[PDB]
Amino acid sequence: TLNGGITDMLTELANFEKNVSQAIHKYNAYRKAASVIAKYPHKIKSGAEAKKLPGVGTKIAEKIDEFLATGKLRKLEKIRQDDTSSSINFLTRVSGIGPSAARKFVDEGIKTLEDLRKNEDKLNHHQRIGLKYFGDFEKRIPREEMLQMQDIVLNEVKKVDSEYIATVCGSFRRGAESSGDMDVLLTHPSFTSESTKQPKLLHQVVEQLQKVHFITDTLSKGETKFMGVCQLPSKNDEKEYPHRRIDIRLIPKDQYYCGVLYFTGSDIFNKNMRAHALEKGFTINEYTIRPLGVTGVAGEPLPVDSEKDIFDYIQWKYREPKDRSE
DNA sequence: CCGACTGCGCATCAGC
DNA sequence: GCTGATGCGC
DNA sequence: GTCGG
Ligand SMILES: Nc1ncnc2c1ncn2[C@H]1C[C@H](O)[C@@H](COP(=O)(O)OP(=O)(O)OP(=O)(O)O)O1
Ligand SMILES: [Cl-]
Ligand SMILES: [Cl-]
Ligand SMILES: [Cl-]
Ligand SMILES: [Cl-]
Ligand SMILES: [Mg+2]
Ligand code: NA
Ligand code: NA
Ligand code: NA
């Protein structure tokens, strides 16, 4: 990428602010600046040039000037050698360990992978699974494996009930050559915004996927959202595939377009689009787009017949999924 | 200057 | 138990 | 940390 050095710097700063400073708005500000620089189609020559972009302000412009002239950022070089910041940043790489738990563990002298492994009884269930698969969860998934995973999920769902529709979203739907995890949107005509005519709709699908040894572990599970672990079957004498994160979201069938818009992302794209909606007087979530009243109270959901309808309401030209990787 | 910053499911905890 | 807040990840 | 009004 043309400006990878700068965007890596801003990403490292974002992670510092989230994990160590617990400053969520700075985390989001740094990620917004990284995203807008990442799509800028020129190699940046100065901080002033970058400051023309929305989300890049005075302080980031100065950091860009430092980075361009020296290849480094003193602020980050100091963070990298600070033990407490390093410890906290490492611990948050375990799924289920966030900024608060990371700092609490450091306080208690739980600081390394070996520390975590000998203190499993101090981890909740999610953290325990995150530790178990620490290495695997940092490996990306090639699209070819995503296709095999898609084939299993769609066929197993069909066997439970042919009226289910499962749609793989996230980075896969945006056409990525590799994905961090698998995201599956699920619908069934029994579950709408008007009624739930059948219970256990998500449970049934999870169970079937566990029964064929595709889903291997559960991080969290409720009526509409499953988060867990899966693994492709391997062949005779072949090394096993890494374990992979899988999320499944059951969305009311009449709200598919809002749900598929949400679950396709990217996360920053959704943030930017939802922010634009607010400036247009709407609010978007994974279920509906609603107008905001004069008082800032969401009104009734607007009719939605396609993903493009949502774009039309907020006066955005339609963007195909592959153009949403912000 | 300064209020506002996208939006939410599930796990966990506090207070009653 | 319920309710509401916080953590976490999405 | 950035920005709109
Ligand atoms: N913070 C968020 N706000 C709004 N939507 C989000 C947020 N995080 C995630 N999403 C939505 C958009 C994402 O594309 C989708 C799936 O999440 P996620 O799996 O983390 O990202 P991803 O599929 O885009 O990339 P990856 O390849 O890393 O898995 O959920
Ligand atoms: Cl902040
Ligand atoms: Cl650096
Ligand atoms: Cl919809
Ligand atoms: Cl809603
Ligand atoms: Mg994903
Ligand atoms: Na700017
Ligand atoms: Na984590
Ligand atoms: Na995901």
Tab-separated table of all heavy atoms in Angstrom, chain A residues 221-225 271 274 283 285 287, chain B residues 4-13:
chain	number	residue	atom	x	y	z
A	221	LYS	N	-23.346	-17.580	23.473
A	221	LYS	CA	-24.475	-18.072	22.689
A	221	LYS	C	-25.758	-17.608	23.342
A	221	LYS	O	-25.956	-17.835	24.538
A	221	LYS	CB	-24.437	-19.590	22.587
A	221	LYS	CG	-25.587	-20.216	21.789
A	221	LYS	CD	-25.407	-21.736	21.757
A	221	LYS	CE	-26.584	-22.453	21.113
A	221	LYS	NZ	-27.789	-22.399	21.997
A	222	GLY	N	-26.602	-16.928	22.573
A	222	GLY	CA	-27.944	-16.573	23.010
A	222	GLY	C	-28.958	-16.900	21.924
A	222	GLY	O	-28.676	-17.709	21.034
A	223	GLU	N	-30.116	-16.239	21.953
A	223	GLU	CA	-31.192	-16.557	21.016
A	223	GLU	C	-30.888	-16.120	19.590
A	223	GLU	O	-31.385	-16.741	18.650
A	223	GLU	CB	-32.498	-15.913	21.483
A	223	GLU	CG	-33.028	-16.504	22.769
A	223	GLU	CD	-33.361	-17.969	22.592
A	223	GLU	OE1	-34.017	-18.306	21.577
A	223	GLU	OE2	-32.939	-18.782	23.439
A	224	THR	N	-30.102	-15.060	19.395
A	224	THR	CA	-29.859	-14.563	18.045
A	224	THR	C	-28.393	-14.432	17.653
A	224	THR	O	-28.128	-14.116	16.489
A	224	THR	CB	-30.525	-13.194	17.832
A	224	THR	OG1	-29.943	-12.247	18.729
A	224	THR	CG2	-32.026	-13.256	18.082
A	225	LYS	N	-27.442	-14.624	18.570
A	225	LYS	CA	-26.027	-14.469	18.246
A	225	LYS	C	-25.225	-15.599	18.869
A	225	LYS	O	-25.279	-15.809	20.087
A	225	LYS	CB	-25.489	-13.122	18.725
A	225	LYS	CG	-24.082	-12.816	18.215
A	225	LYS	CD	-23.661	-11.410	18.567
A	225	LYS	CE	-23.035	-11.361	19.958
A	225	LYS	NZ	-22.538	-9.992	20.259
A	271	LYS	N	-19.495	2.460	10.628
A	271	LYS	CA	-19.367	3.651	11.462
A	271	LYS	C	-19.524	4.910	10.625
A	271	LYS	O	-20.310	5.802	10.964
A	271	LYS	CB	-18.007	3.623	12.172
A	271	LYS	CG	-17.784	4.718	13.221
A	271	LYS	CD	-16.440	4.510	13.948
A	271	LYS	CE	-16.113	5.661	14.935
A	271	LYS	NZ	-15.934	7.014	14.291
A	274	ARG	N	-23.201	5.067	9.279
A	274	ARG	CA	-24.126	5.429	10.347
A	274	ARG	C	-23.921	6.877	10.781
A	274	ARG	O	-24.893	7.579	11.087
A	274	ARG	CB	-23.967	4.468	11.523
A	274	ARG	CG	-24.440	3.061	11.164
A	274	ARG	CD	-23.947	1.991	12.113
A	274	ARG	NE	-24.533	0.694	11.745
A	274	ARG	CZ	-24.670	-0.309	12.597
A	274	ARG	NH1	-24.262	-0.159	13.854
A	274	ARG	NH2	-25.237	-1.445	12.210
A	283	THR	N	-31.135	7.125	11.750
A	283	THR	CA	-30.260	6.230	12.495
A	283	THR	C	-30.372	4.833	11.895
A	283	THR	O	-31.484	4.360	11.625
A	283	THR	CB	-30.607	6.220	13.991
A	283	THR	OG1	-29.754	5.298	14.674
A	283	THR	CG2	-32.080	5.842	14.233
A	285	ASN	N	-29.332	0.759	12.294
A	285	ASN	CA	-28.693	-0.380	12.948
A	285	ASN	C	-28.874	-1.618	12.068
A	285	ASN	O	-29.260	-1.493	10.901
A	285	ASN	CB	-29.248	-0.584	14.362
A	285	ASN	CG	-30.749	-0.786	14.380
A	285	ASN	OD1	-31.331	-1.229	13.397
A	285	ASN	ND2	-31.382	-0.461	15.505
A	287	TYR	N	-31.107	-3.798	12.071
A	287	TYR	CA	-32.502	-4.169	11.912
A	287	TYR	C	-33.275	-3.207	11.026
A	287	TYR	O	-34.100	-3.639	10.213
A	287	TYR	CB	-33.185	-4.216	13.283
A	287	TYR	CG	-32.481	-5.036	14.341
A	287	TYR	CD1	-32.023	-4.445	15.511
A	287	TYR	CD2	-32.307	-6.402	14.186
A	287	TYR	CE1	-31.391	-5.198	16.499
A	287	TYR	CE2	-31.672	-7.161	15.166
A	287	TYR	CZ	-31.220	-6.555	16.316
A	287	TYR	OH	-30.599	-7.321	17.284
B	4	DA	P	-24.221	16.796	23.587
B	4	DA	OP1	-25.641	16.942	23.200
B	4	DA	OP2	-23.823	16.269	24.919
B	4	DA	O5'	-23.550	15.876	22.473
B	4	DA	C5'	-23.656	16.231	21.106
B	4	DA	C4'	-22.763	15.336	20.279
B	4	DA	O4'	-21.398	15.752	20.459
B	4	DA	C3'	-22.801	13.859	20.693
B	4	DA	O3'	-23.397	13.062	19.664
B	4	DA	C2'	-21.330	13.484	20.949
B	4	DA	C1'	-20.580	14.632	20.291
B	4	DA	N9	-19.290	14.912	20.895
B	4	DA	C8	-18.998	14.965	22.222
B	4	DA	N7	-17.740	15.249	22.474
B	4	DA	C5	-17.171	15.386	21.218
B	4	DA	C6	-15.860	15.680	20.799
B	4	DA	N6	-14.845	15.900	21.650
B	4	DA	N1	-15.630	15.747	19.472
B	4	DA	C2	-16.643	15.531	18.628
B	4	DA	N3	-17.911	15.241	18.903
B	4	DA	C4	-18.110	15.183	20.233
B	5	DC	P	-23.491	11.466	19.848
B	5	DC	OP1	-24.655	10.982	19.069
B	5	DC	OP2	-23.340	11.086	21.275
B	5	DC	O5'	-22.161	10.979	19.108
B	5	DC	C5'	-21.878	11.483	17.815
B	5	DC	C4'	-20.480	11.106	17.395
B	5	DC	O4'	-19.522	11.815	18.219
B	5	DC	C3'	-20.131	9.615	17.534
B	5	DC	O3'	-19.486	9.217	16.356
B	5	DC	C2'	-19.157	9.607	18.710
B	5	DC	C1'	-18.470	10.939	18.483
B	5	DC	N1	-17.681	11.432	19.638
B	5	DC	C2	-16.382	11.921	19.422
B	5	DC	O2	-15.930	11.952	18.266
B	5	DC	N3	-15.660	12.356	20.484
B	5	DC	C4	-16.179	12.305	21.708
B	5	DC	N4	-15.430	12.747	22.719
B	5	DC	C5	-17.498	11.812	21.947
B	5	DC	C6	-18.205	11.386	20.894
B	6	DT	P	-19.220	7.674	15.996
B	6	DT	OP1	-18.533	6.975	17.113
B	6	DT	OP2	-18.571	7.758	14.662
B	6	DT	O5'	-20.687	7.055	15.850
B	6	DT	C5'	-21.400	7.257	14.652
B	6	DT	C4'	-22.455	6.180	14.460
B	6	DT	O4'	-21.823	4.885	14.295
B	6	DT	C3'	-23.455	6.011	15.588
B	6	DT	O3'	-24.715	5.693	15.004
B	6	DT	C2'	-22.879	4.830	16.387
B	6	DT	C1'	-22.271	3.986	15.276
B	6	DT	N1	-21.065	3.151	15.651
B	6	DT	C2	-20.985	1.870	15.167
B	6	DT	O2	-21.881	1.350	14.512
B	6	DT	N3	-19.829	1.197	15.499
B	6	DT	C4	-18.759	1.680	16.218
B	6	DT	O4	-17.756	0.993	16.445
B	6	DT	C5	-18.892	3.046	16.675
B	6	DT	C7	-17.795	3.680	17.477
B	6	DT	C6	-20.020	3.713	16.362
B	7	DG	P	-26.059	5.736	15.866
B	7	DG	OP1	-27.156	5.969	14.890
B	7	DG	OP2	-25.869	6.620	17.037
B	7	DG	O5'	-26.196	4.251	16.415
B	7	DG	C5'	-26.549	3.223	15.508
B	7	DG	C4'	-26.328	1.867	16.128
B	7	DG	O4'	-24.921	1.640	16.315
B	7	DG	C3'	-26.962	1.686	17.510
B	7	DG	O3'	-28.053	0.796	17.395
B	7	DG	C2'	-25.829	1.111	18.378
B	7	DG	C1'	-24.810	0.688	17.324
B	7	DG	N9	-23.431	0.633	17.792
B	7	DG	C8	-22.723	1.612	18.453
B	7	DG	N7	-21.501	1.254	18.750
B	7	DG	C5	-21.390	-0.040	18.242
B	7	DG	C6	-20.302	-0.949	18.270
B	7	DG	O6	-19.172	-0.778	18.745
B	7	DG	N1	-20.619	-2.154	17.649
B	7	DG	C2	-21.837	-2.448	17.094
B	7	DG	N2	-21.969	-3.666	16.551
B	7	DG	N3	-22.865	-1.610	17.072
B	7	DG	C4	-22.570	-0.434	17.659
B	8	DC	P	-28.849	0.280	18.691
B	8	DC	OP1	-30.220	0.034	18.203
B	8	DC	OP2	-28.615	1.203	19.831
B	8	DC	O5'	-28.168	-1.125	18.995
B	8	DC	C5'	-28.120	-2.107	17.961
B	8	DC	C4'	-27.521	-3.388	18.478
B	8	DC	O4'	-26.099	-3.212	18.669
B	8	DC	C3'	-28.064	-3.864	19.830
B	8	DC	O3'	-28.116	-5.258	19.810
B	8	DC	C2'	-26.993	-3.391	20.805
B	8	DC	C1'	-25.764	-3.651	19.959
B	8	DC	N1	-24.548	-2.954	20.396
B	8	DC	C2	-23.347	-3.629	20.312
B	8	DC	O2	-23.362	-4.784	19.872
B	8	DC	N3	-22.207	-3.012	20.709
B	8	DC	C4	-22.248	-1.757	21.156
B	8	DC	N4	-21.098	-1.185	21.540
B	8	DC	C5	-23.480	-1.036	21.240
B	8	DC	C6	-24.596	-1.670	20.851
B	9	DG	P	-29.270	-6.041	20.582
B	9	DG	OP1	-30.381	-6.221	19.622
B	9	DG	OP2	-29.475	-5.400	21.895
B	9	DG	O5'	-28.618	-7.477	20.788
B	9	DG	C5'	-28.232	-8.222	19.670
B	9	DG	C4'	-27.374	-9.390	20.086
B	9	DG	O4'	-26.049	-8.927	20.441
B	9	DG	C3'	-27.878	-10.167	21.290
B	9	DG	O3'	-27.508	-11.520	21.131
B	9	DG	C2'	-27.145	-9.502	22.460
B	9	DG	C1'	-25.804	-9.118	21.828
B	9	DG	N9	-25.253	-7.869	22.328
B	9	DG	C8	-25.910	-6.661	22.435
B	9	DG	N7	-25.154	-5.699	22.874
B	9	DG	C5	-23.910	-6.295	23.050
B	9	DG	C6	-22.693	-5.742	23.515
B	9	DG	O6	-22.467	-4.581	23.853
B	9	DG	N1	-21.672	-6.692	23.554
B	9	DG	C2	-21.819	-8.011	23.189
B	9	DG	N2	-20.721	-8.785	23.286
B	9	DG	N3	-22.960	-8.540	22.755
B	9	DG	C4	-23.954	-7.629	22.715
B	10	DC	P	-28.065	-12.658	22.103
B	10	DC	OP1	-28.164	-13.914	21.330
B	10	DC	OP2	-29.250	-12.141	22.820
B	10	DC	O5'	-26.891	-12.822	23.167
B	10	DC	C5'	-25.690	-13.447	22.743
B	10	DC	C4'	-24.636	-13.401	23.818
B	10	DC	O4'	-24.261	-12.036	24.083
B	10	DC	C3'	-25.028	-14.016	25.166
B	10	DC	O3'	-23.985	-14.889	25.525
B	10	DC	C2'	-25.132	-12.781	26.093
B	10	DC	C1'	-24.084	-11.874	25.465
B	10	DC	N1	-24.218	-10.421	25.768
B	10	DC	C2	-23.093	-9.707	26.170
B	10	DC	O2	-22.022	-10.313	26.306
B	10	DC	N3	-23.209	-8.378	26.415
B	10	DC	C4	-24.383	-7.776	26.249
B	10	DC	N4	-24.454	-6.464	26.491
B	10	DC	C5	-25.541	-8.489	25.822
B	10	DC	C6	-25.412	-9.795	25.589
B	11	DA	P	-23.990	-15.773	26.854
B	11	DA	OP1	-23.365	-17.059	26.462
B	11	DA	OP2	-25.329	-15.777	27.499
B	11	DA	O5'	-22.978	-15.009	27.797
B	11	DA	C5'	-21.625	-14.894	27.389
B	11	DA	C4'	-20.767	-14.305	28.488
B	11	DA	O4'	-20.974	-12.870	28.593
B	11	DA	C3'	-20.996	-14.866	29.875
B	11	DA	O3'	-19.734	-14.953	30.496
B	11	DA	C2'	-21.895	-13.806	30.533
B	11	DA	C1'	-21.356	-12.520	29.904
B	11	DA	N9	-22.345	-11.460	29.770
B	11	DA	C8	-23.624	-11.592	29.303
B	11	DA	N7	-24.287	-10.465	29.246
B	11	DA	C5	-23.385	-9.523	29.700
B	11	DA	C6	-23.482	-8.124	29.881
B	11	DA	N6	-24.582	-7.426	29.614
B	11	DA	N1	-22.395	-7.474	30.341
B	11	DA	C2	-21.289	-8.183	30.620
B	11	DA	N3	-21.080	-9.498	30.492
B	11	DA	C4	-22.176	-10.114	30.020
B	12	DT	P	-19.553	-15.599	31.956
B	12	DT	OP1	-18.158	-16.082	31.939
B	12	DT	OP2	-20.682	-16.471	32.337
B	12	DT	O5'	-19.623	-14.347	32.918
B	12	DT	C5'	-18.547	-13.460	32.935
B	12	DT	C4'	-18.878	-12.269	33.787
B	12	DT	O4'	-19.971	-11.546	33.202
B	12	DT	C3'	-19.319	-12.610	35.215
B	12	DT	O3'	-18.306	-12.197	36.088
B	12	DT	C2'	-20.625	-11.808	35.416
B	12	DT	C1'	-20.599	-10.843	34.234
B	12	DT	N1	-21.938	-10.391	33.761
B	12	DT	C2	-22.194	-9.048	33.722
B	12	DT	O2	-21.388	-8.213	34.057
B	12	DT	N3	-23.428	-8.712	33.278
B	12	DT	C4	-24.424	-9.560	32.874
B	12	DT	O4	-25.488	-9.144	32.489
B	12	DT	C5	-24.109	-10.972	32.935
B	12	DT	C7	-25.121	-11.999	32.508
B	12	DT	C6	-22.887	-11.317	33.369
B	13	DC	P	-18.379	-12.491	37.662
B	13	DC	OP1	-16.968	-12.645	38.050
B	13	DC	OP2	-19.334	-13.575	37.957
B	13	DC	O5'	-18.945	-11.125	38.255
B	13	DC	C5'	-18.271	-9.902	37.983
B	13	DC	C4'	-19.082	-8.717	38.479
B	13	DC	O4'	-20.217	-8.508	37.605
B	13	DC	C3'	-19.644	-8.872	39.893
B	13	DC	O3'	-19.220	-7.793	40.708
B	13	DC	C2'	-21.158	-8.858	39.704
B	13	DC	C1'	-21.337	-8.159	38.367
B	13	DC	N1	-22.546	-8.630	37.662
B	13	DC	C2	-23.465	-7.707	37.172
B	13	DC	O2	-23.234	-6.497	37.300
B	13	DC	N3	-24.579	-8.163	36.555
B	13	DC	C4	-24.788	-9.476	36.432
B	13	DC	N4	-25.903	-9.872	35.815
B	13	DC	C5	-23.864	-10.438	36.939
B	13	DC	C6	-22.774	-9.974	37.547
